[PDB]
Amino acid sequence: MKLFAQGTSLDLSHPHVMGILNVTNSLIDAVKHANLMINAGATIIDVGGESTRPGAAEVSVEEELQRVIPVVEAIAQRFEVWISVDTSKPEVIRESAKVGAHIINDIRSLSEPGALEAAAETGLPVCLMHMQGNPKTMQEAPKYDDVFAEVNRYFIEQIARCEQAGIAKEKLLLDPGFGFGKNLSHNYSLLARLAEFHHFNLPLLVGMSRKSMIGQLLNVGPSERLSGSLACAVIAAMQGAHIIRVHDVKETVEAMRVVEATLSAKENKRYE
Angle of CA points 68, 74, 78, to nearest 5°: 145
Active site residue 245: yes
Q: CB of residue 232 vs its own copies: minimum separation in angstroms?
A: 6
Q: Which does 16 bind (CB under 5 to 8 A by kind): ligand 7PM, its own copies, none?
A: none
- Of residues 141 and 192, the one with the C-beta less far from its own copies: 192
Binding mask 118-147 for ligand 7PM (x = CB under 6 A): ---------x-x------------------
- Of residues 4 and 144, the one with the C-beta less far from its own copies: 144
Q: Is residue 214 involved in binding its own copies (CB under 8 A)?
A: yes
| Residue 246 is labelled as binding a ligand | yes
Q: Which stretch binds its own copies (CB under 8 A): 1-9, 110-118, 163-171, 180-188?
A: 180-188
Q: Is residue 175 involved in binding ligand 7PM (CB under 6 A)?
A: yes
Q: Which does 211 bind (CB under 5 to 8 A by kind): its own copies, ligand 7PM, none?
A: ligand 7PM
Residue 198 is given by DSSP the state G
Q: Which of residues 220-239 bind its own copies (CB under 8 A)?
A: 226-228, 230-232, 234-235, 238-239
Q: Is residue 244 involved in binding ligand 7PM (CB under 6 A)?
A: no
- Of residues 207 and 228, the one with the C-beta less far from ligand 7PM: 207
| Residue 31 is labelled as binding a ligand | no
Active site residue 211: yes
| Residue 145 is labelled as binding a ligand | no
